[PDB]
């Protein structure tokens, strides 16, 4: 089947409980993690899935393991503190990819971004140059917005996305009362 | 019901305890299998000065 | 009430629609965090305090049933409600209502009891307010040492410093206020009185012997350059030693209120500084001295030097016991506690001398000792 | 001692009890005792600085209870015991 590692980064800021969008969509994207981990489990149950947030003091909630039975429990107690942290959020997983058991598992990291990015374009091109340098599949998922959705993040992805053939895809969700599961399951990354 | 949403984590910890007691409770059968001899017991209360 | 809020929201004063445009846009967008930031922007602006009585109750209710944003903003805006209304009767029901409303998610009880005690620190009650202040400092001694809540605790120690009962605690918390300052963003025009009553409070502080901790930090000597140097001069003289009595006499009579009764105790405090400096000036070369230097530097008679050294031993900063027959002054361990540069250079001299002497003895003994014994 | 050690030690402060810290050397060229016990406790500072994690030096001793003394003594066969007298005293008094 498919031998690859899955890393998800979820936001724990207070920007995920606003009443305009879904009613505390944290549970909705939790169900998204549930359907992508159970979908990858149905495709290849040997894939390991890690859990970590993007707070100031990043903490590895669950080590990369195919057993999601305790991951379901670890998805709770999100500790809604902090706002956003991007640099050590990338470096806390993309550098931790070397601690996986199976060396044959490809590198794939996703992230749920629910807060505006605090890093300037220089950090976007330095981190994009680092990720394109080490050649890691990066899927950017941006939930919620305050300013325009993609102004510098467009060039961030275009400069970050190498190997145009069957490479990485960008997930941009527009506002709407519909669920996010079917909207993020539309690209080829899900399934 | 937002304050009562933390009970799920407690129930997950308790069912995790029920999932983890099977090993340390399982060694009871191999450690407490058979007393090989018989020994008389005489009760005598002692004092240490928990 | 959302369709019913547009009427009183749109209709406002002449300049209010400037913030009511983005306020109603963020209100229709239902962004509770941006709405909260706009509320803090409206309260932070110097409003006329005339037509805001409606938005205080409206945003009070919205902050009550929103149950999303940190209710500390509600604490601040309700401090502006009790500050604008000046009604302490309903303040207990409002703050208690916030206590009943705020669930057990974040430890905000320190700021809740801080606001309650702060509002109760008026002439109505003092003792129970001091007790609940001790409860505030007693509750949370954990890792969140942001010290901002403890800086408001320093404000409560200032309203407690309004009482002449205890001056020592305001200096102990005033060291924490000395160490918790981040930048000069807060008004310097207030820092004039902050350093004024901070210097006077440090002088009147009877729970400390040296003043070098206050003057040692560069933020106060850097924030006192604008102020008149009549206090910096007497703080440097009180720190580095008072060899004359004319300047300390003119500044001893310069501050008229509350300094007459404390003047004698301040003399009993500064009479030890000449002792610690006279015993730490000469580290070696016949440290033994006589009462002539004490009586000469303190312009006191020979009959009171025994009570002077008896008080010096009663304070506990010195352990000196003299086995003399004819009047002599032998001293012991003492702490400078402020600074000494000639003792830093002399520390390098005597330290390097000790090191090269130990090295000389090591090479001398080990030189032939290693060759004959190994 | 790097700055990140407060975050590394903070995990075992949350999950585990108060953790002791030991700094050693990668090369055994230091003549001093390689082990230094640093307790992870927060102390109040007089200058007014905010309360932070402080590593106070706790004294340590290197001893073996029953078997490691025998194993070390057999594996070395070069070190000497206490041997009060001339050599063990004069070596300390020289070096």
Curated annotation (Swiss-Prot), chain A:
There is a cross-link at residue 122 (Glycyl lysine isopeptide (Lys-Gly) (interchain with G-Cter in SUMO2)). Signal peptide: none annotated. The keyword Repeat applies. GO terms for biological process: proteasome-mediated ubiquitin-dependent protein catabolic process. GO terms for cellular component: cytosol; nucleoplasm; nucleus; proteasome accessory complex; proteasome complex; proteasome regulatory particle, base subcomplex. One of its GO terms (molecular function) is RNA binding. Coiled coil: none annotated. Residues 5-188 form the VWFA domain. Keywords: Isopeptide bond, Phosphoprotein, Proteasome, Repeat, Ubl conjugation. Component of the 19S proteasome regulatory particle complex. The 26S proteasome consists of a 20S core particle (CP) and two 19S regulatory subunits (RP). The regulatory particle is made of a lid composed of 9 subunits, a base containing 6 ATPases and few additional components including PSMD4. Interacts with NUB1. Interacts with SQSTM1. Interacts with UBQLN4. Interacts with UBE3A. Interacts with UBQLN1 (via ubiquitin-like domain). Interacts with DDI2. Component of the 26S proteasome, a multiprotein complex involved in the ATP-dependent degradation of ubiquitinated proteins. This complex plays a key role in the maintenance of protein homeostasis by removing misfolded or damaged proteins, which could impair cellular functions, and by removing proteins whose functions are no longer required. Therefore, the proteasome participates in numerous cellular processes, including cell cycle progression, apoptosis, or DNA damage repair. It comes from Homo sapiens (Human).
From Swiss-Prot, chain B:
Sumoylated by UBE2I in response to MEKK1-mediated stimuli. It is found in: Cytoplasm; Nucleus. Component of the 26S proteasome, a multiprotein complex involved in the ATP-dependent degradation of ubiquitinated proteins. This complex plays a key role in the maintenance of protein homeostasis by removing misfolded or damaged proteins, which could impair cellular functions, and by removing proteins whose functions are no longer required. Therefore, the proteasome participates in numerous cellular processes, including cell cycle progression, apoptosis, or DNA damage repair. Component of the 19S proteasome regulatory particle complex. The 26S proteasome consists of a 20S core particle (CP) and two 19S regulatory subunits (RP). The regulatory particle is made of a lid composed of 9 subunits, a base containing 6 ATPases including PSMC3 and few additional components. Interacts with PAAF1. Belongs to the AAA ATPase family. This is 26S proteasome regulatory subunit 6A. It comes from Homo sapiens (Human). The gene is PSMC3. The chain holds residues 53 to 116 of 439 of the full protein.
From Swiss-Prot, chain C:
Keywords: Acetylation, Proteasome. The modification N6-acetyllysine is found at residue 296. GO terms for biological process: meiosis I; proteasome-mediated ubiquitin-dependent protein catabolic process; ubiquitin-dependent protein catabolic process. It holds the Pfam family PCI. The keyword Oxidoreductase does not apply. PANTHER family: 26S PROTEASOME NON-ATPASE REGULATORY SUBUNIT 13. Belongs to the proteasome subunit S11 family. This is 26S proteasome non-ATPase regulatory subunit 13.
UniProtKB/Swiss-Prot annotation, chain D:
There is a cross-link at residue 80 (Glycyl lysine isopeptide (Lys-Gly) (interchain with G-Cter in ubiquitin)). It comes from the Eukaryota. Coiled coil: none annotated. Component of the 26S proteasome, a multiprotein complex involved in the ATP-dependent degradation of ubiquitinated proteins. This complex plays a key role in the maintenance of protein homeostasis by removing misfolded or damaged proteins, which could impair cellular functions, and by removing proteins whose functions are no longer required. Therefore, the proteasome participates in numerous cellular processes, including cell cycle progression, apoptosis, or DNA damage repair. Does not bind a metal ion. Component of the 19S proteasome regulatory particle complex. The 26S proteasome consists of a 20S core particle (CP) and two 19S regulatory subunits (RP). The regulatory particle is made of a lid composed of 9 subunits including PSMD7, a base containing 6 ATPases and few additional components. Within the complex, PSMD7 interacts with subunit PSMD4 through their respective MPN domain. Interacts with TRIM5. Belongs to the peptidase M67A family. This is 26S proteasome non-ATPase regulatory subunit 7. The chain holds residues 101 to 195 of 324 of the full protein.
């Amino acid at each position: 089947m498919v031998l690859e590692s899955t890393m998800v980064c979820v936001d724990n800021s207070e920007y995920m409980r606003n009443g305009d969008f879904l009613p505390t969509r944290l549970q909705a994207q939790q169900d998204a993690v549930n359907i992508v981990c159970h979908s990858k489990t149905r495709s290849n149950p040997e894939n390991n899935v890690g859990l970590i947030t993007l707070a100031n003091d990043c903490e590895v909630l669950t080590t990369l393991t195919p057993d999601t039975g305790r991951i379901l429990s670890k998805l709770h107690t999100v500790q809604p503190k902090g706002k956003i942290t991007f640099c050590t959020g990338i470096r806390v997983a993309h550098l931790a990819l070397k601690h996986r058991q199976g060396k044959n598992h490809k590198m794939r990291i996703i992230a749920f971004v629910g807060s505006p990015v605090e890093d300037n374009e220089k950090d976007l091109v330095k981190l994009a140059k680092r990720l394109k340098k080490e050649k890691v599949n990066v899927d950017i998922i941006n939930f919620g917005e305050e300013e325009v959705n993609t102004e510098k993040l467009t060039a961030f992805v275009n400069t970050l996305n190498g190997k145009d053939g069957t490479g990485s895809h960008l997930v941009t969700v527009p506002p709407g009362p519909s669920l996010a599961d079917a909207l993020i399951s539309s690209p080829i990354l899900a399934g | 019901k937002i304050m009562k949403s933390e009970v799920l984590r407690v129930t997950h910890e308790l069912q995790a305890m029920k999932d983890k007691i099977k090993e340390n409770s399982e060694k009871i059968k191999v450690n407490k299998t058979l007393p090989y001899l018989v020994s008389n017991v005489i009760e005598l209360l002692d004092v240490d000065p928990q | 009430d959302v369709p019913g809020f547009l009427q009183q929201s749109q209709n406002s004063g002449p300049g209010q629609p400037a913030v009511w445009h983005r306020l109603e846009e963020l209100y229709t967008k239902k962004l509770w965090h941006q709405l909260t930031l706009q509320v803090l922007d409206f309260v932070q602006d110097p409003c006329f305090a005339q037509g805001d009585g409606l938005i205080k109750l409206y945003e009070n209710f919205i902050s009550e049933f929103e149950h999303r944003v940190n209710p500390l903003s509600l604490v601040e805006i309700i401090l502006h409600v009790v500050r604008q209304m000046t009604d302490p009767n309903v303040a207990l029901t409002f703050l208690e209502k916030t206590r009943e409303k705020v669930k057990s998610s974040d430890e905000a009880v320190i700021l809740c009891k801080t606001a309650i005690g702060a509002l109760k620190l008026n002439i109505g009650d003092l003792q129970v307010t001091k007790e609940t202040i001790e409860d505030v400092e007693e509750m949370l001694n954990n890792l969140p040492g942001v010290t901002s809540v403890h800086s408001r605790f320093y404000d409560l120690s200032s309203k407690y410093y309004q009482t002449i009962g205890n001056h020592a605690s305001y200096y102990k918390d005033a060291l924490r206020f000395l160490g918790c300052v981040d930048i000069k963003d807060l008004p310097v025009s207030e820092q004039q009185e902050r350093a004024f009553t901070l210097g006077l409070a440090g002088l009147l502080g009877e729970g400390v012997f040296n003043f070098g901790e206050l003057l040692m930090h560069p933020v106060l000597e850097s924030l006192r350059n604008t102020d008149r140097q009549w206090l910096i001069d007497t703080l440097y003289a009180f720190n580095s030693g008072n060899v004359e009595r004319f300047q300390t006499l003119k500044t001893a009579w310069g501050q008229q209120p509350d300094l007459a009764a404390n003047e004698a105790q301040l003399l009993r405090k500064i009479q030890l500084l000449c002792l610690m400096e006279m015993t730490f000036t000469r580290p070696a070369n016949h440290r033994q001295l006589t009462f002539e230097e004490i009586a000469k530097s303190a312009k006191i008679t020979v009959n009171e030097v025994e009570l002077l050294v008896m008080k010096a031993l009663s304070v506990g900063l010195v352990k000196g016991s003299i086995d003399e027959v004819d009047k002599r002054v032998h001293m012991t361990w003492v702490q400078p506690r402020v600074l000494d540069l000639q003792q830093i250079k002399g520390m390098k001299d005597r330290l390097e001398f000790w090191c090269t002497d130990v090295k000389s003895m090591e090479m001398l003994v080990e030189h032939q000792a290693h060759d004959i014994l190994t | 001692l790097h700055k990140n050690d407060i975050a590394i030690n903070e995990l075992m402060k949350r999950y585990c009890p108060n953790s002791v810290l030991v700094i050693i050397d990668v090369k055994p060229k230091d003549l001093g005792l390689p082990t230094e016990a640093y307790i992870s406790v927060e102390e109040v500072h007089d200058d007014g600085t905010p309360t932070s994690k402080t590593f106070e030096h706790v004294t340590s001793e290197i001893g073996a209870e029953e078997a490691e003394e025998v194993g070390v003594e057999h594996l070395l066969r070069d070190i000497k015991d206490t041997t009060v007298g001339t050599l063990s005293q004069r070596i300390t008094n020289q070096v």
